Amino acid sequence: DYFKQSFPEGYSWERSMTYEDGGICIATNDITMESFINKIHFKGTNFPPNGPVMQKRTVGWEASTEKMYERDGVLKGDVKMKLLLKGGGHYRCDYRTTYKVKQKLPDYHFVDHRIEILSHDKDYNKVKLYEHAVARMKNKLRMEGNVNGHAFVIEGEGSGKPFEGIQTIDLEVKEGAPLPFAYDILTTAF
């Protein structure tokens, strides 16, 4: 697939995440081989202080299916996800991502996604994540982000490909702990 023949140089994507309560996030990744190396800059704005994200009232994302397609000449990927709240309600969020693979089609292409937090330390300092991407090695990760004016940096280590297949990560907050927002808004950007 487009991410397989893009290496050993690497590819990149820009991701927009529009939440229901006005909060919006934009994240860019630059993936390269050295082992897979990931450098991501994350930023979210206008998350309500009484909302679920800034008050940590979320408990992981539900299973989802991203649809990939061709736009102008670009490879795009639409999907609307539902974040499950601590309370029984749901918290919707739209994902509009642009995959800028180096190898710059006619039909559609769907990818099922499943992300869960298997276990995590209190305050989500050390977190273990499980990612699952299905069509129809080692991975070093580093994220420097800022959410609602609070900067932070997350480092991680994991196994598996970062575009498809099964992937497990062991993340740890190095600068910015403790995070004052729901960690679930970052698990997708990884």
Side-chain angles (χ1 to χ4, degrees), residues 1-3 5-8 10-33 35-38 40-49 51-70 73-79 81 83-85 87-91 93-95 97-99 101 106 108-113 115 117-120 123-125 127-139 141-143 145-156 158-160 162-174 176-190:
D1 206 34
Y2 286 89
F3 318 104
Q5 327 96 2
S6 210
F7 276 96
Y11 71 98
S12 286
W13 50 258
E14 294 112 42
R15 176 160 306 173
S16 79
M17 296 163 257
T18 323
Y19 291 80
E20 221 178 15
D21 61 352
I24 304 188
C25 299
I26 299 184
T28 69
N29 190 347
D30 292 275
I31 313 139
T32 167
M33 194 130 74
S35 148
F36 287 130
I37 304 278
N38 274 249
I40 299 144
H41 314 275
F42 193 96
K43 186 211 208 60
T45 51
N46 307 11
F47 270 124
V53 165
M54 300 302 308
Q55 303 227 271
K56 306 202 255 177
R57 286 158 39 205
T58 79
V59 280
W61 300 76
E62 291 184 10
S64 173
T65 85
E66 164 164 26
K67 58 158 266 207
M68 326 268 280
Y69 62 99
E70 173 234 24
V74 202
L75 182 77
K76 303 271 233 301
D78 294 357
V79 61
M81 307 199 146
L83 182 56
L84 185 98
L85 306 166
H90 286 176
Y91 183 34
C93 176
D94 282 71
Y95 276 44
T97 88
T98 298
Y99 301 106
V101 307
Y108 271 146
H109 271 98
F110 308 89
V111 177
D112 320 83
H113 297 267
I115 320 183
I117 296 180
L118 312 162
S119 160
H120 59 80
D123 286 31
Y124 285 80
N125 285 330
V127 179
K128 186 184 282 256
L129 188 86
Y130 155 72
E131 274 192 290
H132 194 43
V134 172
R136 301 207 304 217
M137 317 187 197
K138 191 195 82 28
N139 195 346
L141 290 123
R142 188 205 133 82
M143 196 178 92
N146 172 89
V147 172
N148 258 45
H150 169 260
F152 67 102
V153 157
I154 299 175
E155 306 202 70
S159 324
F163 43 88
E164 268 225 322
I166 298 148
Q167 207 210 304
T168 64
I169 324 171
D170 311 63
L171 304 144
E172 181 156 9
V173 177
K174 313 254 76 145
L179 291 187
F181 46 88
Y183 202 84
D184 287 325
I185 67 166
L186 322 171
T187 66
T188 46
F190 287 131

PDB file of all heavy atoms in Angstrom, residues 13-18 24-29 41-43 66 77 79 81 94-99 113 115 131 162 186-190, unseen atoms left out:
ATOM      1  N   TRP A  13       1.579  12.926   7.325  1.00  0.00           N
ATOM      2  CA  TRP A  13       0.153  13.209   7.252  1.00  0.00           C
ATOM      3  C   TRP A  13      -0.185  14.411   8.122  1.00  0.00           C
ATOM      4  O   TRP A  13       0.474  14.676   9.131  1.00  0.00           O
ATOM      5  CB  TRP A  13      -0.713  12.006   7.661  1.00  0.00           C
ATOM      6  CG  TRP A  13      -0.355  11.336   8.964  1.00  0.00           C
ATOM      7  CD1 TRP A  13       0.342  10.173   9.117  1.00  0.00           C
ATOM      8  CD2 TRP A  13      -0.714  11.763  10.287  1.00  0.00           C
ATOM      9  NE1 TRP A  13       0.456   9.859  10.450  1.00  0.00           N
ATOM     10  CE2 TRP A  13      -0.185  10.817  11.188  1.00  0.00           C
ATOM     11  CE3 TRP A  13      -1.421  12.854  10.797  1.00  0.00           C
ATOM     12  CZ2 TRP A  13      -0.337  10.934  12.568  1.00  0.00           C
ATOM     13  CZ3 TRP A  13      -1.570  12.967  12.169  1.00  0.00           C
ATOM     14  CH2 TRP A  13      -1.034  12.012  13.036  1.00  0.00           C
ATOM     15  N   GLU A  14      -1.218  15.139   7.704  1.00  0.00           N
ATOM     16  CA  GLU A  14      -1.793  16.240   8.464  1.00  0.00           C
ATOM     17  C   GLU A  14      -3.228  15.878   8.811  1.00  0.00           C
ATOM     18  O   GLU A  14      -4.006  15.500   7.929  1.00  0.00           O
ATOM     19  CB  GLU A  14      -1.747  17.549   7.671  1.00  0.00           C
ATOM     20  CG  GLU A  14      -0.343  18.077   7.414  1.00  0.00           C
ATOM     21  CD  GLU A  14       0.047  18.011   5.949  1.00  0.00           C
ATOM     22  OE1 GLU A  14      -0.797  18.348   5.091  1.00  0.00           O
ATOM     23  OE2 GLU A  14       1.198  17.625   5.654  1.00  0.00           O
ATOM     24  N   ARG A  15      -3.579  15.993  10.090  1.00  0.00           N
ATOM     25  CA  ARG A  15      -4.847  15.488  10.601  1.00  0.00           C
ATOM     26  C   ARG A  15      -5.610  16.598  11.302  1.00  0.00           C
ATOM     27  O   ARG A  15      -5.057  17.287  12.165  1.00  0.00           O
ATOM     28  CB  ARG A  15      -4.613  14.324  11.566  1.00  0.00           C
ATOM     29  CG  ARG A  15      -5.860  13.787  12.235  1.00  0.00           C
ATOM     30  CD  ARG A  15      -5.611  12.381  12.748  1.00  0.00           C
ATOM     31  NE  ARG A  15      -5.112  11.509  11.690  1.00  0.00           N
ATOM     32  CZ  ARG A  15      -4.677  10.269  11.884  1.00  0.00           C
ATOM     33  NH1 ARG A  15      -4.673   9.748  13.105  1.00  0.00           N
ATOM     34  NH2 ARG A  15      -4.246   9.551  10.855  1.00  0.00           N
ATOM     35  N   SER A  16      -6.878  16.761  10.937  1.00  0.00           N
ATOM     36  CA  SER A  16      -7.780  17.694  11.595  1.00  0.00           C
ATOM     37  C   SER A  16      -8.858  16.916  12.338  1.00  0.00           C
ATOM     38  O   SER A  16      -9.421  15.954  11.806  1.00  0.00           O
ATOM     39  CB  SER A  16      -8.420  18.653  10.587  1.00  0.00           C
ATOM     40  OG  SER A  16      -9.488  18.031   9.895  1.00  0.00           O
ATOM     41  N   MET A  17      -9.136  17.330  13.572  1.00  0.00           N
ATOM     42  CA  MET A  17     -10.084  16.640  14.440  1.00  0.00           C
ATOM     43  C   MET A  17     -11.061  17.663  15.003  1.00  0.00           C
ATOM     44  O   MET A  17     -10.688  18.482  15.849  1.00  0.00           O
ATOM     45  CB  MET A  17      -9.360  15.897  15.562  1.00  0.00           C
ATOM     46  CG  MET A  17      -8.452  14.780  15.068  1.00  0.00           C
ATOM     47  SD  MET A  17      -7.247  14.248  16.299  1.00  0.00           S
ATOM     48  CE  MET A  17      -5.766  15.047  15.691  1.00  0.00           C
ATOM     49  N   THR A  18     -12.307  17.612  14.537  1.00  0.00           N
ATOM     50  CA  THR A  18     -13.341  18.575  14.907  1.00  0.00           C
ATOM     51  C   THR A  18     -14.300  17.914  15.890  1.00  0.00           C
ATOM     52  O   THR A  18     -15.037  16.993  15.522  1.00  0.00           O
ATOM     53  CB  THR A  18     -14.084  19.072  13.670  1.00  0.00           C
ATOM     54  OG1 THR A  18     -13.160  19.205  12.582  1.00  0.00           O
ATOM     55  CG2 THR A  18     -14.735  20.416  13.943  1.00  0.00           C
ATOM     56  N   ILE A  24     -11.210  21.794  18.692  1.00  0.00           N
ATOM     57  CA  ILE A  24     -10.636  21.320  17.438  1.00  0.00           C
ATOM     58  C   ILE A  24      -9.153  21.056  17.648  1.00  0.00           C
ATOM     59  O   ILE A  24      -8.484  21.775  18.399  1.00  0.00           O
ATOM     60  CB  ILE A  24     -10.858  22.332  16.293  1.00  0.00           C
ATOM     61  CG1 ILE A  24     -12.348  22.649  16.137  1.00  0.00           C
ATOM     62  CG2 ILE A  24     -10.290  21.798  14.989  1.00  0.00           C
ATOM     63  CD1 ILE A  24     -12.679  23.472  14.915  1.00  0.00           C
ATOM     64  N   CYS A  25      -8.642  20.016  16.990  1.00  0.00           N
ATOM     65  CA  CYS A  25      -7.237  19.643  17.070  1.00  0.00           C
ATOM     66  C   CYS A  25      -6.665  19.471  15.671  1.00  0.00           C
ATOM     67  O   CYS A  25      -7.347  18.979  14.766  1.00  0.00           O
ATOM     68  CB  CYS A  25      -7.049  18.350  17.866  1.00  0.00           C
ATOM     69  SG  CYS A  25      -7.609  18.446  19.575  1.00  0.00           S
ATOM     70  N   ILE A  26      -5.411  19.883  15.502  1.00  0.00           N
ATOM     71  CA  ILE A  26      -4.664  19.678  14.266  1.00  0.00           C
ATOM     72  C   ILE A  26      -3.311  19.087  14.630  1.00  0.00           C
ATOM     73  O   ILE A  26      -2.631  19.590  15.531  1.00  0.00           O
ATOM     74  CB  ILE A  26      -4.488  20.986  13.468  1.00  0.00           C
ATOM     75  CG1 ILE A  26      -5.848  21.564  13.069  1.00  0.00           C
ATOM     76  CG2 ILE A  26      -3.632  20.746  12.232  1.00  0.00           C
ATOM     77  CD1 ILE A  26      -5.753  22.806  12.208  1.00  0.00           C
ATOM     78  N   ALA A  27      -2.924  18.018  13.938  1.00  0.00           N
ATOM     79  CA  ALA A  27      -1.666  17.341  14.214  1.00  0.00           C
ATOM     80  C   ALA A  27      -0.995  16.950  12.908  1.00  0.00           C
ATOM     81  O   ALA A  27      -1.657  16.503  11.967  1.00  0.00           O
ATOM     82  CB  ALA A  27      -1.874  16.097  15.089  1.00  0.00           C
ATOM     83  N   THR A  28       0.323  17.124  12.859  1.00  0.00           N
ATOM     84  CA  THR A  28       1.131  16.753  11.710  1.00  0.00           C
ATOM     85  C   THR A  28       2.182  15.743  12.143  1.00  0.00           C
ATOM     86  O   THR A  28       2.765  15.865  13.225  1.00  0.00           O
ATOM     87  CB  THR A  28       1.810  17.978  11.083  1.00  0.00           C
ATOM     88  OG1 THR A  28       2.811  18.484  11.976  1.00  0.00           O
ATOM     89  CG2 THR A  28       0.790  19.070  10.806  1.00  0.00           C
ATOM     90  N   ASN A  29       2.417  14.744  11.298  1.00  0.00           N
ATOM     91  CA  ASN A  29       3.394  13.700  11.561  1.00  0.00           C
ATOM     92  C   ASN A  29       4.432  13.674  10.450  1.00  0.00           C
ATOM     93  O   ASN A  29       4.139  13.989   9.295  1.00  0.00           O
ATOM     94  CB  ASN A  29       2.725  12.325  11.670  1.00  0.00           C
ATOM     95  CG  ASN A  29       3.666  11.250  12.185  1.00  0.00           C
ATOM     96  OD1 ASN A  29       4.881  11.439  12.242  1.00  0.00           O
ATOM     97  ND2 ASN A  29       3.101  10.113  12.572  1.00  0.00           N
ATOM     98  N   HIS A  41       3.548  16.914  16.010  1.00  0.00           N
ATOM     99  CA  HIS A  41       3.218  18.144  16.718  1.00  0.00           C
ATOM    100  C   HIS A  41       1.701  18.240  16.816  1.00  0.00           C
ATOM    101  O   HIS A  41       1.009  18.269  15.793  1.00  0.00           O
ATOM    102  CB  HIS A  41       3.805  19.360  16.001  1.00  0.00           C
ATOM    103  CG  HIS A  41       5.231  19.176  15.580  1.00  0.00           C
ATOM    104  ND1 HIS A  41       6.294  19.422  16.423  1.00  0.00           N
ATOM    105  CD2 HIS A  41       5.768  18.761  14.409  1.00  0.00           C
ATOM    106  CE1 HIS A  41       7.424  19.171  15.788  1.00  0.00           C
ATOM    107  NE2 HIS A  41       7.133  18.768  14.564  1.00  0.00           N
ATOM    108  N   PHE A  42       1.192  18.277  18.044  1.00  0.00           N
ATOM    109  CA  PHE A  42      -0.236  18.231  18.325  1.00  0.00           C
ATOM    110  C   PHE A  42      -0.680  19.558  18.924  1.00  0.00           C
ATOM    111  O   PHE A  42       0.045  20.164  19.719  1.00  0.00           O
ATOM    112  CB  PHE A  42      -0.552  17.079  19.286  1.00  0.00           C
ATOM    113  CG  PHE A  42      -2.015  16.750  19.400  1.00  0.00           C
ATOM    114  CD1 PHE A  42      -2.571  15.732  18.641  1.00  0.00           C
ATOM    115  CD2 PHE A  42      -2.830  17.440  20.285  1.00  0.00           C
ATOM    116  CE1 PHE A  42      -3.914  15.420  18.748  1.00  0.00           C
ATOM    117  CE2 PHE A  42      -4.175  17.134  20.397  1.00  0.00           C
ATOM    118  CZ  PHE A  42      -4.718  16.122  19.627  1.00  0.00           C
ATOM    119  N   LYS A  43      -1.868  20.018  18.539  1.00  0.00           N
ATOM    120  CA  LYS A  43      -2.401  21.249  19.107  1.00  0.00           C
ATOM    121  C   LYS A  43      -3.919  21.206  19.089  1.00  0.00           C
ATOM    122  O   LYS A  43      -4.521  20.908  18.053  1.00  0.00           O
ATOM    123  CB  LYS A  43      -1.899  22.481  18.348  1.00  0.00           C
ATOM    124  CG  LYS A  43      -2.314  23.791  18.998  1.00  0.00           C
ATOM    125  CD  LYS A  43      -2.515  24.891  17.976  1.00  0.00           C
ATOM    126  CE  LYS A  43      -2.240  26.245  18.593  1.00  0.00           C
ATOM    127  NZ  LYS A  43      -0.843  26.317  19.101  1.00  0.00           N
ATOM    128  N   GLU A  66     -12.225   4.044   8.891  1.00  0.00           N
ATOM    129  CA  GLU A  66     -11.809   5.157   8.048  1.00  0.00           C
ATOM    130  C   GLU A  66     -11.920   4.780   6.577  1.00  0.00           C
ATOM    131  O   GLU A  66     -11.585   3.660   6.184  1.00  0.00           O
ATOM    132  CB  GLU A  66     -10.369   5.556   8.373  1.00  0.00           C
ATOM    133  CG  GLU A  66      -9.709   6.431   7.316  1.00  0.00           C
ATOM    134  CD  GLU A  66      -8.464   7.121   7.826  1.00  0.00           C
ATOM    135  OE1 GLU A  66      -7.836   6.595   8.768  1.00  0.00           O
ATOM    136  OE2 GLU A  66      -8.120   8.194   7.291  1.00  0.00           O
ATOM    137  N   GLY A  77      -8.375  10.841   3.835  1.00  0.00           N
ATOM    138  CA  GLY A  77      -9.018   9.829   4.650  1.00  0.00           C
ATOM    139  C   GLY A  77     -10.065  10.386   5.592  1.00  0.00           C
ATOM    140  O   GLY A  77      -9.730  10.975   6.625  1.00  0.00           O
ATOM    141  N   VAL A  79     -13.288  10.065   8.253  1.00  0.00           N
ATOM    142  CA  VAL A  79     -13.983   9.212   9.213  1.00  0.00           C
ATOM    143  C   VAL A  79     -14.519  10.042  10.375  1.00  0.00           C
ATOM    144  O   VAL A  79     -13.835  10.930  10.894  1.00  0.00           O
ATOM    145  CB  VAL A  79     -13.079   8.076   9.730  1.00  0.00           C
ATOM    146  CG1 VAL A  79     -11.858   8.627  10.452  1.00  0.00           C
ATOM    147  CG2 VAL A  79     -13.875   7.144  10.612  1.00  0.00           C
ATOM    148  N   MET A  81     -15.632   9.698  14.202  1.00  0.00           N
ATOM    149  CA  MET A  81     -15.459   8.812  15.341  1.00  0.00           C
ATOM    150  C   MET A  81     -16.345   9.255  16.496  1.00  0.00           C
ATOM    151  O   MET A  81     -16.798  10.401  16.563  1.00  0.00           O
ATOM    152  CB  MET A  81     -13.997   8.775  15.792  1.00  0.00           C
ATOM    153  CG  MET A  81     -13.019   8.454  14.678  1.00  0.00           C
ATOM    154  SD  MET A  81     -11.434   7.894  15.321  1.00  0.00           S
ATOM    155  CE  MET A  81     -10.966   6.702  14.071  1.00  0.00           C
ATOM    156  N   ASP A  94     -15.166  14.517  14.236  1.00  0.00           N
ATOM    157  CA  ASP A  94     -14.891  14.235  12.836  1.00  0.00           C
ATOM    158  C   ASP A  94     -13.395  14.310  12.568  1.00  0.00           C
ATOM    159  O   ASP A  94     -12.706  15.210  13.060  1.00  0.00           O
ATOM    160  CB  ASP A  94     -15.635  15.214  11.927  1.00  0.00           C
ATOM    161  CG  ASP A  94     -17.100  14.859  11.766  1.00  0.00           C
ATOM    162  OD1 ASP A  94     -17.860  15.021  12.745  1.00  0.00           O
ATOM    163  OD2 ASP A  94     -17.493  14.411  10.667  1.00  0.00           O
ATOM    164  N   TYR A  95     -12.899  13.359  11.780  1.00  0.00           N
ATOM    165  CA  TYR A  95     -11.490  13.271  11.420  1.00  0.00           C
ATOM    166  C   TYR A  95     -11.350  13.511   9.923  1.00  0.00           C
ATOM    167  O   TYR A  95     -11.960  12.801   9.117  1.00  0.00           O
ATOM    168  CB  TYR A  95     -10.908  11.907  11.795  1.00  0.00           C
ATOM    169  CG  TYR A  95     -10.449  11.791  13.232  1.00  0.00           C
ATOM    170  CD1 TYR A  95     -11.226  12.276  14.274  1.00  0.00           C
ATOM    171  CD2 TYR A  95      -9.239  11.186  13.545  1.00  0.00           C
ATOM    172  CE1 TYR A  95     -10.809  12.168  15.589  1.00  0.00           C
ATOM    173  CE2 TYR A  95      -8.815  11.073  14.856  1.00  0.00           C
ATOM    174  CZ  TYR A  95      -9.604  11.565  15.872  1.00  0.00           C
ATOM    175  OH  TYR A  95      -9.186  11.457  17.178  1.00  0.00           O
ATOM    176  N   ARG A  96     -10.550  14.511   9.557  1.00  0.00           N
ATOM    177  CA  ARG A  96     -10.229  14.810   8.162  1.00  0.00           C
ATOM    178  C   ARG A  96      -8.707  14.858   8.059  1.00  0.00           C
ATOM    179  O   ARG A  96      -8.080  15.820   8.511  1.00  0.00           O
ATOM    180  CB  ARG A  96     -10.867  16.120   7.712  1.00  0.00           C
ATOM    181  CG  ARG A  96     -11.811  15.981   6.530  1.00  0.00           C
ATOM    182  CD  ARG A  96     -12.068  17.328   5.867  1.00  0.00           C
ATOM    183  NH2 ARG A  96     -14.956  15.822   4.908  1.00  0.00           N
ATOM    184  N   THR A  97      -8.118  13.818   7.474  1.00  0.00           N
ATOM    185  CA  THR A  97      -6.672  13.649   7.445  1.00  0.00           C
ATOM    186  C   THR A  97      -6.169  13.597   6.008  1.00  0.00           C
ATOM    187  O   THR A  97      -6.810  13.004   5.134  1.00  0.00           O
ATOM    188  CB  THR A  97      -6.252  12.376   8.182  1.00  0.00           C
ATOM    189  OG1 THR A  97      -6.263  11.273   7.270  1.00  0.00           O
ATOM    190  CG2 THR A  97      -7.215  12.083   9.319  1.00  0.00           C
ATOM    191  N   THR A  98      -5.011  14.213   5.778  1.00  0.00           N
ATOM    192  CA  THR A  98      -4.371  14.261   4.467  1.00  0.00           C
ATOM    193  C   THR A  98      -3.046  13.517   4.557  1.00  0.00           C
ATOM    194  O   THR A  98      -2.118  13.976   5.231  1.00  0.00           O
ATOM    195  CB  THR A  98      -4.153  15.705   4.016  1.00  0.00           C
ATOM    196  OG1 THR A  98      -5.417  16.367   3.889  1.00  0.00           O
ATOM    197  CG2 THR A  98      -3.427  15.741   2.683  1.00  0.00           C
ATOM    198  N   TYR A  99      -2.956  12.376   3.878  1.00  0.00           N
ATOM    199  CA  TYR A  99      -1.749  11.557   3.885  1.00  0.00           C
ATOM    200  C   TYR A  99      -0.851  11.993   2.733  1.00  0.00           C
ATOM    201  O   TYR A  99      -1.178  11.775   1.562  1.00  0.00           O
ATOM    202  CB  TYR A  99      -2.100  10.076   3.779  1.00  0.00           C
ATOM    203  CG  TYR A  99      -2.980   9.585   4.903  1.00  0.00           C
ATOM    204  CD1 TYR A  99      -4.329   9.326   4.694  1.00  0.00           C
ATOM    205  CD2 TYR A  99      -2.465   9.391   6.177  1.00  0.00           C
ATOM    206  CE1 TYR A  99      -5.137   8.878   5.723  1.00  0.00           C
ATOM    207  CE2 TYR A  99      -3.266   8.948   7.210  1.00  0.00           C
ATOM    208  CZ  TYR A  99      -4.598   8.692   6.979  1.00  0.00           C
ATOM    209  OH  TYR A  99      -5.394   8.250   8.010  1.00  0.00           O
ATOM    210  N   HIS A 113     -10.538   0.677  12.363  1.00  0.00           N
ATOM    211  CA  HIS A 113      -9.636   1.118  13.416  1.00  0.00           C
ATOM    212  C   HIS A 113     -10.203   0.754  14.780  1.00  0.00           C
ATOM    213  O   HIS A 113     -11.411   0.862  15.011  1.00  0.00           O
ATOM    214  CB  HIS A 113      -9.391   2.628  13.337  1.00  0.00           C
ATOM    215  CG  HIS A 113      -8.708   3.064  12.078  1.00  0.00           C
ATOM    216  ND1 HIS A 113      -7.339   3.200  11.982  1.00  0.00           N
ATOM    217  CD2 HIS A 113      -9.204   3.396  10.862  1.00  0.00           C
ATOM    218  CE1 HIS A 113      -7.023   3.595  10.762  1.00  0.00           C
ATOM    219  NE2 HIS A 113      -8.136   3.722  10.063  1.00  0.00           N
ATOM    220  N   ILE A 115      -8.802   1.397  18.837  1.00  0.00           N
ATOM    221  CA  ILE A 115      -7.797   1.932  19.749  1.00  0.00           C
ATOM    222  C   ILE A 115      -8.320   1.807  21.174  1.00  0.00           C
ATOM    223  O   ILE A 115      -9.467   2.171  21.456  1.00  0.00           O
ATOM    224  CB  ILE A 115      -7.453   3.396  19.419  1.00  0.00           C
ATOM    225  CG1 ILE A 115      -7.380   3.597  17.904  1.00  0.00           C
ATOM    226  CG2 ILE A 115      -6.144   3.798  20.078  1.00  0.00           C
ATOM    227  CD1 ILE A 115      -6.973   4.992  17.499  1.00  0.00           C
ATOM    228  N   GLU A 131      -3.228  -0.533  19.204  1.00  0.00           N
ATOM    229  CA  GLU A 131      -3.779   0.008  17.969  1.00  0.00           C
ATOM    230  C   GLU A 131      -4.003  -1.116  16.965  1.00  0.00           C
ATOM    231  O   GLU A 131      -3.204  -2.053  16.878  1.00  0.00           O
ATOM    232  CB  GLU A 131      -2.855   1.074  17.371  1.00  0.00           C
ATOM    233  CG  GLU A 131      -3.083   2.467  17.938  1.00  0.00           C
ATOM    234  CD  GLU A 131      -2.372   3.548  17.147  1.00  0.00           C
ATOM    235  OE1 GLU A 131      -1.125   3.606  17.205  1.00  0.00           O
ATOM    236  OE2 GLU A 131      -3.060   4.342  16.472  1.00  0.00           O
ATOM    237  N   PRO A 162       3.204   1.441  11.667  1.00  0.00           N
ATOM    238  CA  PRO A 162       2.357   2.561  12.104  1.00  0.00           C
ATOM    239  C   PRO A 162       1.258   2.959  11.128  1.00  0.00           C
ATOM    240  O   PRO A 162       0.605   3.980  11.359  1.00  0.00           O
ATOM    241  CB  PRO A 162       3.374   3.701  12.251  1.00  0.00           C
ATOM    242  CG  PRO A 162       4.509   3.348  11.312  1.00  0.00           C
ATOM    243  CD  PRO A 162       4.356   1.910  10.879  1.00  0.00           C
ATOM    244  N   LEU A 186      -5.333  12.216  22.337  1.00  0.00           N
ATOM    245  CA  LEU A 186      -4.007  12.056  21.761  1.00  0.00           C
ATOM    246  C   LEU A 186      -3.739  10.660  21.224  1.00  0.00           C
ATOM    247  O   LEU A 186      -2.853  10.505  20.379  1.00  0.00           O
ATOM    248  CB  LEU A 186      -2.925  12.393  22.800  1.00  0.00           C
ATOM    249  CG  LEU A 186      -3.195  13.554  23.756  1.00  0.00           C
ATOM    250  CD1 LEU A 186      -2.130  13.599  24.840  1.00  0.00           C
ATOM    251  CD2 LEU A 186      -3.249  14.870  23.000  1.00  0.00           C
ATOM    252  N   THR A 187      -4.480   9.649  21.686  1.00  0.00           N
ATOM    253  CA  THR A 187      -4.183   8.271  21.307  1.00  0.00           C
ATOM    254  C   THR A 187      -4.322   8.052  19.807  1.00  0.00           C
ATOM    255  O   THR A 187      -3.681   7.154  19.250  1.00  0.00           O
ATOM    256  CB  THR A 187      -5.096   7.312  22.067  1.00  0.00           C
ATOM    257  OG1 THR A 187      -6.453   7.512  21.654  1.00  0.00           O
ATOM    258  CG2 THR A 187      -4.988   7.554  23.566  1.00  0.00           C
ATOM    259  N   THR A 188      -5.147   8.856  19.137  1.00  0.00           N
ATOM    260  CA  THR A 188      -5.305   8.717  17.696  1.00  0.00           C
ATOM    261  C   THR A 188      -4.115   9.281  16.934  1.00  0.00           C
ATOM    262  O   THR A 188      -3.745   8.745  15.884  1.00  0.00           O
ATOM    263  CB  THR A 188      -6.585   9.413  17.238  1.00  0.00           C
ATOM    264  OG1 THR A 188      -6.667  10.708  17.846  1.00  0.00           O
ATOM    265  CG2 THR A 188      -7.803   8.595  17.638  1.00  0.00           C
ATOM    266  N   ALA A 189      -3.505  10.346  17.445  1.00  0.00           N
ATOM    267  CA  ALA A 189      -2.415  11.018  16.749  1.00  0.00           C
ATOM    268  C   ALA A 189      -1.136  10.188  16.742  1.00  0.00           C
ATOM    269  O   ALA A 189      -0.260  10.406  15.907  1.00  0.00           O
ATOM    270  CB  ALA A 189      -2.154  12.379  17.377  1.00  0.00           C
ATOM    271  N   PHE A 190      -1.031   9.241  17.671  1.00  0.00           N
ATOM    272  CA  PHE A 190       0.160   8.410  17.797  1.00  0.00           C
ATOM    273  C   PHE A 190       0.338   7.508  16.574  1.00  0.00           C
ATOM    274  O   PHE A 190       0.869   7.920  15.598  1.00  0.00           O
ATOM    275  CB  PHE A 190       0.087   7.545  19.056  1.00  0.00           C
ATOM    276  CG  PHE A 190       0.301   8.396  20.305  1.00  0.00           C
ATOM    277  CD1 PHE A 190      -0.578   8.288  21.372  1.00  0.00           C
ATOM    278  CD2 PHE A 190       1.369   9.274  20.376  1.00  0.00           C
ATOM    279  CE1 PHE A 190      -0.390   9.056  22.509  1.00  0.00           C
ATOM    280  CE2 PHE A 190       1.557  10.044  21.514  1.00  0.00           C
ATOM    281  CZ  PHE A 190       0.677   9.935  22.579  1.00  0.00           C
TER     282      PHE A 190
END
